[PDB]
Amino acid sequence: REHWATRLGLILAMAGYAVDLGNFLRFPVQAAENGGGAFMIPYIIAFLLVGIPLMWIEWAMGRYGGAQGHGTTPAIFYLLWRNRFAKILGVFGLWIPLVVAIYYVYIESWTLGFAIKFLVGLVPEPPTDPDSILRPFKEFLYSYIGVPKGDEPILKPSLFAYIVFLITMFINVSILIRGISKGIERFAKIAMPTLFILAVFLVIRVFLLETPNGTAADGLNFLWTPDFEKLKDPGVWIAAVGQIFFSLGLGFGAIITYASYVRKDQDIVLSGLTAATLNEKAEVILGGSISIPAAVAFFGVANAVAIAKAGAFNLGFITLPAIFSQTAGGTFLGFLWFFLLFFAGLTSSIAGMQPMIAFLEDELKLSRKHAVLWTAAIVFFSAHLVMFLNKSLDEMDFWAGTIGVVFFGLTELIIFFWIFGADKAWEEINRGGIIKVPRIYYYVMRYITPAFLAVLLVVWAREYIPKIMEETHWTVWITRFYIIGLFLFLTFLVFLAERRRNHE
Ligand SMILES: CCCCCCCCO[C@@H]1O[C@H](CO)[C@@H](O)[C@H](O)[C@H]1O
Ligand SMILES: CCCCCCCCO[C@@H]1O[C@H](CO)[C@@H](O)[C@H](O)[C@H]1O
Ligand SMILES: O[C@]1(c2ccc(Cl)cc2)c2ccccc2C2=NCCN21
Ligand code: NA
Ligand code: NA
């Protein structure tokens, strides 16, 4: 079995997985909308009661499975729980990262695409008033994706958008086809420092921004001034547990697969703790210091609330580019911003395709070359649904990327800590540990952690599921049809895997 070469590479690959577009866009907007500095109260709590416990569990499950030659959840769930229904539930840990990969690599390609257009100067140059600057960039983005100009839910990506998508797939395959240590690990050691340098340079330049409408301090102010009155709102605590769960990328099946390349007795308690921390530092220090302070510096604290309400996507793909076109050296600034996001995306997409590659390798005994190429093929082909059908992206992100991961997160806890056995699980987590998990966490993992996840799931099921089902366009059935098929197809592969094993 392949293994991580160095402890540092392992930590950087894992941190690379967690640190994504969300760190620099989603988190700052969530924080501004949910109590500013006060949001750190339920955020740290969520990190301690949900994020850290579950992450350790996923590392343990991954390492446990890897020792027996299995890096994915159909095989691993079966090992923790010998039942046919365990295998079926395990398919989700293969299906979720696959579906997310199907739209996420495309989004990732947008940033590479924007980075190049900025570098070579193929971007709008307004002219005045805020809308006079924002609109040409709104239009730039819309022409790239091919946002529908009519009533048809049809997208028309530019040739440039399409070729960059091809290039992006090529880069992913390039890394993945070289394997865990010589490919993913080697790349983490380059991308993670590069990421840090870009962010630090941006944080510095943002902190020097001064306009007639405000400064970076005004931005940092608005973001971090606490609003403790929002702590009463249940949705703020849900937001925190939600934010933590998603920032760490728990429930995607990715962490388990990566951990399966950790050796049987190699530490996971400290390594895991360090990786989660890197994500957090990247999130609150760097992520919170770039996008919101820059936006508020240019548009003024008066529009801060409006900016936060406009969302993470608009901030990163419309608002900030517009600001860069109005600032000195903003052309090279825009390149750095989108290059930064691209590496943030790239370190995450490789991790998210690895479970499929691992499954093809571990269970169907494919060579790495074939496993990577076929995985790329399924992802490349399927992505045409995301590129051409409007709102397809949102549908996949809801079922797989939102509802799915929380359900799968809860499923992992129960199978490992309740079915497999809390005591067997506890020893599994601490074995080889440079540090030992604090004894209090034995109760957290068994009762508190699943309780939190259950509450989150129910609130979200009650809140969002009725809306998506009753108020959406008929074309959503196209996306549902396709991803349900993917689940059927994966089930078949799991079926073929167990049959091959019975023969040999
Ligand atoms: C943290 C960054 C997350 C990236 C969010 C990507 C969501 C963009 O998604 C797309 O945006 C287009 C522009 O409005 C819309 O026309 C499409 O309906 C939508 O699918
Ligand atoms: C059924 C699979 C067909 C997938 C078609 C993908 C290629 C079509 O591509 C289309 O044509 C233009 C150039 O070709 C580009 O502007 C865009 O990529 C796209 O709109
Ligand atoms: O960027 C992701 C991610 C997860 C899986 C893949 Cl295949 C690609 C990207 C992501 C997407 C959507 C919601 C949450 C998350 C996430 N958490 C860490 C990495 N990561
Ligand atoms: Na993150
Ligand atoms: Na990443």
Coordinates of C-alpha atoms and ligand atoms in Angstrom, one line a residue:
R1 CA 0.0 0.0 0.0
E2 CA 1.1 3.5 -0.7
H3 CA 2.0 5.6 2.3
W4 CA 2.7 9.3 3.2
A5 CA 6.5 9.7 3.1
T6 CA 6.8 12.4 5.8
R7 CA 4.7 13.6 8.7
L8 CA 4.9 17.2 7.3
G9 CA 3.6 16.1 3.9
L10 CA 0.7 14.3 5.6
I11 CA -0.2 17.3 7.6
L12 CA 0.0 19.6 4.6
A13 CA -2.1 17.3 2.4
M14 CA -4.8 17.2 5.0
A15 CA -4.6 21.0 5.7
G16 CA -4.6 21.5 1.9
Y17 CA -7.8 19.5 1.8
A18 CA -9.5 21.6 4.5
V19 CA -8.3 25.0 3.3
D20 CA -10.5 25.9 0.3
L21 CA -12.5 28.7 -1.3
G22 CA -14.7 28.7 1.8
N23 CA -11.8 29.8 4.0
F24 CA -11.4 33.1 2.1
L25 CA -15.0 33.8 1.1
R26 CA -17.7 31.8 3.0
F27 CA -16.3 32.1 6.6
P28 CA -15.9 35.9 6.6
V29 CA -19.5 36.4 5.3
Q30 CA -20.8 33.9 7.9
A31 CA -19.0 35.6 10.7
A32 CA -20.2 39.1 9.7
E33 CA -23.8 37.8 9.5
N34 CA -23.8 35.9 12.7
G35 CA -22.5 38.2 15.4
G36 CA -19.1 39.3 14.1
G37 CA -16.6 38.7 16.9
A38 CA -19.3 37.1 19.0
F39 CA -19.6 34.4 16.4
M40 CA -16.3 33.0 17.7
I41 CA -18.1 31.9 20.8
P42 CA -20.2 29.2 19.2
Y43 CA -17.5 28.7 16.6
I44 CA -14.8 27.6 19.0
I45 CA -17.4 25.5 20.9
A46 CA -18.4 23.8 17.7
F47 CA -14.8 23.2 16.9
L48 CA -14.3 21.5 20.3
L49 CA -17.5 19.5 20.4
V50 CA -18.0 18.6 16.8
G51 CA -15.1 19.4 14.4
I52 CA -12.1 18.0 16.4
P53 CA -13.9 14.8 17.7
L54 CA -15.3 13.8 14.3
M55 CA -12.1 14.5 12.5
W56 CA -10.1 12.3 14.9
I57 CA -12.7 9.6 14.3
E58 CA -12.3 9.8 10.5
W59 CA -8.5 9.6 10.8
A60 CA -8.9 6.5 13.0
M61 CA -11.4 4.9 10.6
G62 CA -9.1 5.6 7.7
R63 CA -6.0 4.3 9.3
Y64 CA -7.9 1.3 10.6
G65 CA -9.1 0.5 7.1
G66 CA -5.8 1.2 5.4
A67 CA -4.0 -1.4 7.6
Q68 CA -6.3 -4.0 5.9
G69 CA -5.9 -2.6 2.4
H70 CA -9.1 -0.6 2.2
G71 CA -9.3 3.1 1.9
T72 CA -13.0 3.7 1.2
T73 CA -16.2 3.4 3.2
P74 CA -18.0 0.5 1.5
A75 CA -15.2 -1.8 2.6
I76 CA -14.4 0.0 5.9
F77 CA -18.0 0.2 7.1
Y78 CA -18.3 -3.5 6.5
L79 CA -15.2 -4.1 8.6
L80 CA -16.6 -2.1 11.5
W81 CA -20.0 -3.7 11.0
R82 CA -20.5 -7.0 9.1
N83 CA -23.9 -6.3 7.5
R84 CA -25.0 -5.9 3.9
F85 CA -26.6 -2.6 4.9
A86 CA -23.1 -1.4 6.0
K87 CA -21.8 -1.7 2.4
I88 CA -24.7 0.2 1.0
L89 CA -24.3 3.1 3.5
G90 CA -20.6 3.0 2.6
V91 CA -21.4 3.9 -1.1
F92 CA -22.3 7.4 0.1
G93 CA -18.7 7.9 1.1
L94 CA -17.8 7.2 -2.5
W95 CA -20.8 9.0 -4.0
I96 CA -20.6 12.3 -2.1
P97 CA -17.0 13.2 -3.0
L98 CA -17.6 12.1 -6.6
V99 CA -20.7 14.3 -7.0
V100 CA -19.0 17.3 -5.3
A101 CA -16.0 16.7 -7.6
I102 CA -18.3 16.8 -10.6
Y103 CA -19.2 20.5 -10.0
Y104 CA -16.2 21.7 -7.9
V105 CA -13.4 21.2 -10.4
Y106 CA -15.5 23.3 -12.7
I107 CA -15.7 26.1 -10.2
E108 CA -12.0 25.6 -9.6
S109 CA -11.4 26.1 -13.3
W110 CA -13.1 29.5 -13.1
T111 CA -10.5 30.9 -10.7
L112 CA -7.6 29.7 -13.0
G113 CA -9.5 31.2 -15.9
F114 CA -10.0 34.6 -14.0
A115 CA -6.3 34.5 -13.0
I116 CA -5.1 34.3 -16.5
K117 CA -7.5 36.9 -17.9
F118 CA -6.3 39.3 -15.1
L119 CA -2.6 38.5 -15.7
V120 CA -2.8 39.2 -19.5
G121 CA -5.2 42.1 -18.9
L122 CA -8.3 40.6 -20.7
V123 CA -10.6 42.0 -18.0
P124 CA -13.1 45.0 -17.9
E125 CA -11.9 48.5 -17.1
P126 CA -14.6 50.7 -15.7
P127 CA -15.9 53.6 -15.7
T128 CA -18.3 56.9 -10.4
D129 CA -21.0 55.0 -8.6
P130 CA -20.8 51.4 -7.2
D131 CA -23.1 49.8 -9.8
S132 CA -21.0 51.4 -12.6
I133 CA -18.0 49.4 -11.5
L134 CA -19.7 46.2 -10.4
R135 CA -21.9 45.7 -13.5
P136 CA -19.1 45.2 -16.1
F137 CA -17.7 42.5 -13.9
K138 CA -21.0 40.9 -13.3
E139 CA -21.3 40.8 -17.1
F140 CA -17.7 39.5 -17.4
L141 CA -18.6 36.6 -15.1
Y142 CA -21.9 36.0 -16.8
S143 CA -20.3 35.7 -20.2
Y144 CA -17.7 33.2 -18.9
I145 CA -20.2 30.8 -17.3
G146 CA -22.7 31.5 -20.0
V147 CA -25.5 32.6 -17.7
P148 CA -28.8 32.3 -19.5
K149 CA -30.0 35.5 -21.3
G150 CA -33.4 34.0 -21.9
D151 CA -36.0 31.8 -20.1
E152 CA -34.2 28.6 -21.0
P153 CA -32.1 27.0 -18.2
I154 CA -29.3 26.7 -20.7
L155 CA -25.7 27.7 -20.0
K156 CA -23.2 28.6 -22.7
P157 CA -19.7 28.5 -21.3
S158 CA -17.2 30.5 -23.4
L159 CA -14.6 28.5 -25.4
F160 CA -12.1 30.0 -22.9
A161 CA -14.1 28.8 -20.0
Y162 CA -14.2 25.3 -21.6
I163 CA -10.5 25.1 -22.4
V164 CA -9.5 26.2 -19.0
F165 CA -11.8 23.5 -17.6
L166 CA -9.8 21.0 -19.7
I167 CA -6.5 22.4 -18.5
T168 CA -7.8 22.2 -14.9
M169 CA -8.8 18.5 -15.3
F170 CA -5.4 17.9 -16.8
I171 CA -3.6 19.4 -13.8
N172 CA -5.6 17.4 -11.4
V173 CA -4.9 14.2 -13.3
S174 CA -1.2 15.1 -13.5
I175 CA -0.9 15.3 -9.7
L176 CA -3.2 12.3 -9.0
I177 CA -1.6 9.9 -11.5
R178 CA 1.7 10.3 -9.7
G179 CA 0.2 8.8 -6.5
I180 CA 0.0 9.7 -2.8
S181 CA 3.7 10.5 -1.9
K182 CA 5.2 11.4 -5.2
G183 CA 2.1 13.2 -6.4
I184 CA -0.3 14.5 -3.8
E185 CA 2.3 14.8 -1.0
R186 CA 4.9 16.4 -3.2
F187 CA 2.3 18.9 -4.4
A188 CA 1.1 19.8 -0.9
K189 CA 4.6 20.8 0.0
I190 CA 4.7 23.4 -2.8
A191 CA 1.1 24.6 -2.8
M192 CA 0.7 25.1 1.0
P193 CA 3.7 27.4 1.3
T194 CA 2.7 29.2 -1.9
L195 CA -0.8 29.6 -0.6
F196 CA 0.6 31.1 2.6
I197 CA 2.9 33.6 0.8
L198 CA 0.1 34.8 -1.5
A199 CA -2.3 35.3 1.4
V200 CA 0.3 37.2 3.5
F201 CA 1.1 39.4 0.5
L202 CA -2.6 40.1 0.0
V203 CA -3.3 40.7 3.7
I204 CA -0.4 43.2 3.7
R205 CA -1.6 45.0 0.6
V206 CA -5.2 45.1 1.8
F207 CA -4.1 46.6 5.1
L208 CA -2.6 49.5 3.2
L209 CA -5.8 50.3 1.3
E210 CA -7.1 53.8 1.8
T211 CA -10.0 55.2 -0.2
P212 CA -12.4 58.2 0.2
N213 CA -15.0 55.6 1.4
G214 CA -12.9 53.9 4.1
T215 CA -9.9 51.8 5.1
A216 CA -9.0 48.2 5.9
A217 CA -9.3 48.9 9.6
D218 CA -13.0 49.9 9.0
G219 CA -13.4 46.5 7.4
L220 CA -11.7 44.5 10.1
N221 CA -13.7 46.6 12.6
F222 CA -17.1 45.7 11.1
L223 CA -16.1 42.0 10.9
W224 CA -14.8 41.6 14.4
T225 CA -17.0 43.9 16.6
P226 CA -19.1 41.5 18.6
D227 CA -22.9 41.4 18.5
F228 CA -23.7 39.2 21.5
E229 CA -27.4 39.7 21.0
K230 CA -27.2 37.4 18.0
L231 CA -26.1 34.6 20.4
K232 CA -29.7 34.0 21.3
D233 CA -30.6 33.1 17.8
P234 CA -30.6 29.3 17.3
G235 CA -29.6 29.8 13.6
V236 CA -26.3 31.4 14.8
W237 CA -25.3 28.2 16.7
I238 CA -26.5 26.1 13.7
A239 CA -24.4 28.3 11.4
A240 CA -21.4 27.7 13.6
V241 CA -21.7 23.9 13.8
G242 CA -22.5 24.0 10.0
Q243 CA -19.5 26.3 9.3
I244 CA -17.1 24.1 11.2
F245 CA -18.4 20.9 9.7
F246 CA -18.0 22.2 6.2
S247 CA -14.7 24.1 6.7
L248 CA -13.0 20.9 7.9
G249 CA -14.7 18.9 5.1
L250 CA -16.0 16.3 7.4
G251 CA -18.4 13.7 6.0
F252 CA -17.0 13.8 2.5
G253 CA -15.2 10.5 2.6
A254 CA -12.0 12.3 1.7
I255 CA -10.3 12.4 5.1
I256 CA -10.9 8.7 5.6
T257 CA -9.3 7.8 2.3
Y258 CA -6.2 10.0 3.0
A259 CA -5.8 8.6 6.5
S260 CA -5.8 5.1 4.9
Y261 CA -2.3 5.9 3.6
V262 CA -1.1 6.5 7.2
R263 CA 0.8 3.5 8.6
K264 CA -0.8 1.2 11.2
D265 CA 0.9 2.7 14.3
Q266 CA 1.7 6.2 13.1
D267 CA 0.2 9.1 15.1
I268 CA -3.1 10.6 14.1
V269 CA -4.1 12.4 17.3
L270 CA -1.5 15.2 17.1
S271 CA -1.3 15.2 13.3
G272 CA -5.0 15.5 13.0
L273 CA -5.2 18.3 15.6
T274 CA -2.4 20.2 13.8
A275 CA -4.2 20.0 10.4
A276 CA -7.5 21.2 11.8
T277 CA -5.7 24.1 13.4
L278 CA -3.9 25.1 10.2
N279 CA -7.4 25.2 8.6
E280 CA -8.6 27.4 11.4
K281 CA -5.7 29.8 11.3
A282 CA -6.0 30.1 7.5
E283 CA -9.7 30.7 8.1
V284 CA -9.8 33.4 10.7
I285 CA -6.4 35.1 10.3
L286 CA -6.0 35.1 6.5
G287 CA -9.5 34.6 5.2
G288 CA -11.0 37.2 7.5
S289 CA -8.3 39.8 6.6
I290 CA -8.6 39.9 2.9
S291 CA -12.1 39.9 1.3
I292 CA -14.3 41.8 3.8
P293 CA -11.8 44.4 4.8
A294 CA -10.9 45.1 1.2
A295 CA -14.6 45.3 0.2
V296 CA -15.4 47.6 3.1
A297 CA -12.3 49.7 2.4
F298 CA -13.5 50.5 -1.1
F299 CA -17.3 50.8 -0.6
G300 CA -17.4 52.1 3.0
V301 CA -18.8 50.6 6.2
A302 CA -22.3 51.9 5.1
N303 CA -22.5 49.1 2.6
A304 CA -20.8 46.4 4.7
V305 CA -24.1 44.7 5.7
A306 CA -25.3 44.8 2.0
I307 CA -22.0 43.3 0.9
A308 CA -22.2 40.5 3.5
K309 CA -25.8 39.8 2.4
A310 CA -24.7 39.7 -1.3
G311 CA -22.9 36.4 -0.4
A312 CA -19.6 34.7 -0.7
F313 CA -19.7 34.1 -4.5
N314 CA -20.4 37.7 -5.4
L315 CA -17.7 38.9 -3.1
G316 CA -15.1 36.7 -4.7
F317 CA -16.0 36.8 -8.4
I318 CA -17.7 40.2 -8.8
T319 CA -17.1 42.6 -6.0
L320 CA -13.3 42.0 -5.4
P321 CA -12.4 41.9 -9.1
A322 CA -14.2 45.3 -9.5
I323 CA -12.2 46.7 -6.6
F324 CA -8.9 45.3 -8.1
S325 CA -9.7 47.2 -11.4
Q326 CA -9.8 50.4 -9.4
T327 CA -6.7 50.0 -7.3
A328 CA -3.0 50.6 -8.1
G329 CA -1.4 47.4 -9.6
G330 CA -4.8 45.8 -9.2
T331 CA -4.2 43.8 -12.3
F332 CA -1.4 41.8 -10.6
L333 CA -3.5 41.9 -7.5
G334 CA -6.4 40.2 -9.2
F335 CA -4.0 37.5 -10.6
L336 CA -2.8 36.8 -7.0
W337 CA -6.3 36.6 -5.6
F338 CA -7.5 34.0 -8.2
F339 CA -4.2 32.1 -8.2
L340 CA -4.6 31.9 -4.5
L341 CA -8.2 30.5 -4.8
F342 CA -7.1 28.2 -7.6
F343 CA -4.5 26.5 -5.4
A344 CA -7.0 26.4 -2.6
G345 CA -9.4 24.6 -4.9
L346 CA -6.7 22.3 -6.5
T347 CA -5.5 21.0 -3.1
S348 CA -9.1 20.2 -2.3
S349 CA -10.2 18.6 -5.6
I350 CA -7.3 16.1 -5.7
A351 CA -8.4 14.9 -2.2
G352 CA -11.9 14.6 -3.4
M353 CA -11.2 12.3 -6.4
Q354 CA -8.9 10.1 -4.4
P355 CA -11.7 8.0 -2.8
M356 CA -12.9 6.9 -6.3
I357 CA -9.3 6.2 -7.3
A358 CA -8.7 4.3 -4.1
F359 CA -11.9 2.2 -4.6
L360 CA -10.9 1.3 -8.1
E361 CA -7.4 0.3 -6.9
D362 CA -8.4 -1.4 -3.6
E363 CA -11.5 -3.3 -4.6
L364 CA -11.4 -3.7 -8.4
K365 CA -7.6 -4.1 -8.4
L366 CA -7.0 -1.5 -11.1
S367 CA -3.6 0.1 -11.6
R368 CA -3.2 3.6 -10.4
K369 CA -3.0 4.9 -14.0
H370 CA -6.3 3.2 -15.0
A371 CA -7.9 4.2 -11.7
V372 CA -7.0 7.9 -12.1
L373 CA -7.9 8.0 -15.8
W374 CA -11.3 6.3 -15.4
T375 CA -12.1 8.5 -12.4
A376 CA -11.2 11.6 -14.5
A377 CA -13.4 10.3 -17.3
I378 CA -16.5 9.9 -15.1
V379 CA -15.8 13.3 -13.6
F380 CA -15.0 15.0 -16.9
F381 CA -18.1 13.6 -18.7
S382 CA -20.5 14.2 -15.8
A383 CA -19.3 17.8 -15.4
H384 CA -21.0 18.6 -18.7
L385 CA -24.2 18.6 -16.8
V386 CA -22.8 21.3 -14.5
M387 CA -21.5 23.3 -17.4
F388 CA -24.6 23.4 -19.6
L389 CA -27.6 23.0 -17.3
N390 CA -28.4 26.1 -15.2
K391 CA -28.9 25.5 -11.5
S392 CA -27.6 21.9 -11.9
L393 CA -24.6 22.9 -9.7
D394 CA -26.8 24.0 -6.8
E395 CA -28.8 20.8 -6.9
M396 CA -25.7 18.6 -6.6
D397 CA -24.3 20.8 -3.9
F398 CA -27.5 20.4 -1.9
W399 CA -27.9 16.6 -1.9
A400 CA -24.2 15.6 -1.8
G401 CA -22.4 18.7 -0.5
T402 CA -24.9 19.8 2.1
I403 CA -27.5 17.3 3.3
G404 CA -25.4 14.3 2.4
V405 CA -22.2 15.1 4.3
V406 CA -24.1 15.8 7.6
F407 CA -26.0 12.5 7.3
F408 CA -22.8 10.7 6.4
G409 CA -21.0 12.4 9.3
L410 CA -23.6 11.0 11.7
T411 CA -23.5 7.6 10.1
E412 CA -19.7 7.4 10.7
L413 CA -20.0 8.2 14.4
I414 CA -22.7 5.6 15.0
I415 CA -20.9 2.8 13.0
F416 CA -17.5 3.5 14.7
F417 CA -18.4 4.5 18.2
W418 CA -21.7 2.7 18.8
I419 CA -21.8 -0.4 16.5
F420 CA -18.1 -1.2 16.3
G421 CA -17.8 -0.3 20.0
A422 CA -16.7 2.9 21.8
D423 CA -13.9 1.1 23.6
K424 CA -12.5 -0.5 20.5
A425 CA -12.9 2.9 18.8
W426 CA -11.2 4.8 21.6
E427 CA -8.1 2.5 21.5
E428 CA -8.1 2.9 17.7
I429 CA -7.9 6.7 18.0
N430 CA -5.1 6.9 20.6
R431 CA -2.9 4.1 19.4
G432 CA 0.6 5.4 18.3
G433 CA -0.5 8.8 19.5
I434 CA 2.2 11.3 20.3
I435 CA -0.4 12.8 22.6
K436 CA -3.5 11.1 24.0
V437 CA -7.0 12.3 23.4
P438 CA -8.3 13.9 26.6
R439 CA -10.5 11.5 28.5
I440 CA -13.4 13.9 28.4
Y441 CA -13.6 13.4 24.7
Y442 CA -14.8 9.8 25.2
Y443 CA -18.2 11.2 26.3
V444 CA -18.2 14.0 23.7
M445 CA -17.7 11.6 20.8
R446 CA -20.3 9.2 22.1
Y447 CA -23.2 11.5 23.1
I448 CA -22.5 15.2 22.4
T449 CA -21.1 15.0 18.9
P450 CA -23.9 12.8 17.5
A451 CA -26.5 14.9 19.3
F452 CA -25.2 18.1 17.6
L453 CA -25.1 16.4 14.2
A454 CA -28.6 15.0 14.6
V455 CA -30.0 18.5 15.5
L456 CA -28.2 20.1 12.6
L457 CA -29.6 17.5 10.2
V458 CA -33.2 17.8 11.4
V459 CA -33.3 21.6 11.4
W460 CA -31.8 21.6 7.9
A461 CA -34.1 18.9 6.6
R462 CA -37.1 20.8 7.9
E463 CA -35.9 24.1 6.6
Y464 CA -34.4 23.5 3.2
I465 CA -35.9 20.2 1.9
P466 CA -39.5 21.5 1.4
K467 CA -38.2 24.5 -0.5
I468 CA -36.0 22.6 -3.0
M469 CA -38.7 20.1 -3.7
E470 CA -41.7 22.4 -4.2
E471 CA -40.4 25.7 -5.6
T472 CA -37.8 24.6 -8.1
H473 CA -37.9 24.3 -11.9
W474 CA -38.7 20.9 -13.5
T475 CA -35.1 20.7 -14.8
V476 CA -34.0 19.8 -11.2
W477 CA -35.3 16.3 -11.9
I478 CA -32.6 16.0 -14.6
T479 CA -29.9 16.5 -12.0
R480 CA -31.6 14.3 -9.4
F481 CA -32.0 11.6 -12.1
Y482 CA -28.3 11.7 -13.0
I483 CA -26.9 11.6 -9.5
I484 CA -29.3 8.9 -8.4
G485 CA -28.0 6.9 -11.4
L486 CA -24.4 7.5 -10.2
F487 CA -25.4 6.0 -6.9
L488 CA -26.9 3.0 -8.7
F489 CA -23.7 2.7 -10.8
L490 CA -21.5 2.8 -7.7
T491 CA -23.6 0.2 -5.9
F492 CA -23.1 -2.0 -8.9
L493 CA -19.3 -1.5 -8.7
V494 CA -19.5 -2.4 -5.0
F495 CA -21.5 -5.5 -6.1
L496 CA -18.9 -6.5 -8.7
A497 CA -16.2 -6.0 -6.1
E498 CA -17.7 -8.4 -3.6
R499 CA -18.2 -11.0 -6.4
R500 CA -14.6 -10.8 -7.6
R501 CA -13.5 -11.4 -4.0
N502 CA -15.6 -14.5 -3.7
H503 CA -13.9 -15.9 -6.8
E504 CA -10.4 -15.2 -5.6
Ligands
LIG1 C1 -17.1 29.9 -1.6 C2 -17.2 30.1 -3.1 C3 -18.4 29.3 -3.6 C4 -18.6 29.5 -5.0 C5 -20.1 29.6 -5.3 C6 -20.4 29.3 -6.7 C7 -21.9 29.4 -7.0 C8 -22.0 30.1 -8.3 O1 -23.1 29.4 -9.0 C9 -23.6 30.0 -10.2 O2 -23.6 31.4 -10.0 C10 -24.1 31.9 -11.2 C11 -23.9 33.4 -11.1 O3 -25.0 34.0 -10.5 C12 -25.5 31.6 -11.4 O4 -26.0 32.1 -12.6 C13 -25.7 30.1 -11.4 O5 -27.1 29.9 -11.2 C14 -25.0 29.5 -10.2 O6 -25.1 28.1 -10.4
LIG2 C1 -22.8 15.2 -25.1 C2 -21.4 15.7 -24.8 C3 -21.2 16.9 -25.7 C4 -20.3 17.9 -24.9 C5 -20.0 19.1 -25.7 C6 -18.9 19.8 -25.1 C7 -18.2 20.6 -26.2 C8 -19.2 21.7 -26.6 O1 -18.7 22.9 -26.2 C9 -19.5 24.1 -26.5 O2 -19.0 24.6 -27.7 C10 -18.1 25.7 -27.6 C11 -16.9 25.2 -28.3 O3 -17.0 23.9 -28.6 C12 -17.7 26.3 -26.3 O4 -17.9 27.6 -26.3 C13 -18.3 25.7 -25.1 O5 -17.4 24.8 -24.6 C14 -19.5 25.0 -25.3 O6 -20.6 25.8 -25.3
LIG3 O1 -13.8 22.4 -1.1 C1 -14.5 21.2 -0.5 C2 -14.4 20.0 -1.3 C3 -14.8 18.8 -0.9 C4 -14.7 17.7 -1.8 C5 -14.3 17.9 -3.1 CL1 -14.3 16.6 -4.2 C6 -14.0 19.2 -3.5 C7 -14.0 20.2 -2.7 C8 -15.9 21.5 -0.2 C9 -17.0 21.7 -1.1 C10 -18.2 22.0 -0.6 C11 -18.5 22.1 0.8 C12 -17.5 21.9 1.7 C13 -16.2 21.6 1.2 C14 -14.9 21.4 1.8 N1 -14.3 21.3 3.0 C15 -12.8 21.1 2.9 C16 -12.6 20.9 1.4 N2 -13.9 21.1 0.9
NA4 NA -11.9 25.0 5.3
NA5 NA -7.7 23.1 -0.7

